[PDB]
Amino acid sequence: SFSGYLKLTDNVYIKNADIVEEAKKVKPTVVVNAANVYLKHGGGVAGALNKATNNAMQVESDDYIATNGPLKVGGSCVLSGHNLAKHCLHVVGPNVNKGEDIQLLKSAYENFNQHEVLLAPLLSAGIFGADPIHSLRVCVDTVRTNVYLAVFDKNLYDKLVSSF
């Protein structure tokens, strides 16, 4: 059901798309959220995915944190995908704007290997402060399963594809 994606490697594909609209169209088995350790979905991809679930993702996340405590930077948890997907894999990449170690980005992408196919954003990009070209390079060199990347900004998408 994924269509209009450029092929980067044997297993990594990319599209200039709104990940919420892409999830509603495809209804994948797994959509990846670019989460923080507290699962507080305020801005960026996290806020957009939560808003499309009418806040059901945040209510479910708050119960998960109340039971288990916060995630590790580089870690993940599988929760419901609500109206967007069967499941949502909440992955925490390092937030470079908070002094988190960039080496944890490879650990964050290793979580994708537990799932055969994923619709995902670039981790640690945007408001997390890491270089998006570096995030795409770590993705290609780490993920072995089929990943379909959705990049919202047209100019960033063109730069990622021309510099790859």
C-beta nearest to ligand A1AKR: residue:
126
Closest to ligand A1AKR by CB, 12 or 125 = 125
Amino acid at site 95:
N
Q: Output the smallest distance, CB 125 to ligand A1AKR, in A.
A: 4
Tokens coding 53: 């679930």
Amino acid at site 59:
V
Give the whole-angstrom CA distance, residue 43 versus residue 27: 22
Q: Output the smallest distance, CB 121 to ligand A1AKR, in A.
A: 5
152 binds ligand A1AKR (CB under 6 A): yes
Q: Output the smallest distance, CB 47 to ligand A1AKR, in A.
A: 7
Cα–Cα distances in angstroms (integers) from residue 83 to residues 20, 118, 122, 161, 164, in the given order: 10, 16, 22, 30, 33
Of 5, 18, 37, 80, the one binding ligand A1AKR by CB under 6 A: 18
Strand pairing category for 117-120 and 76-80: unpaired
Give the whole-angstrom CA distance, residue 45 versus residue 18: 9
Hey, which residues between 28 and 67 contact ligand A1AKR (CB under 6 A)?
44-45, 48, 52
Closest to ligand A1AKR by CB, 73 or 136 = 136
CA-based nearest residue to 160, from 125, 140, 120, 133? 133
Q: Output the smallest distance, CB 29 to ligand A1AKR, in A.
A: 20
Q: How many residues at the interface with ligand A1AKR, by CB under 6 A?
A: 15
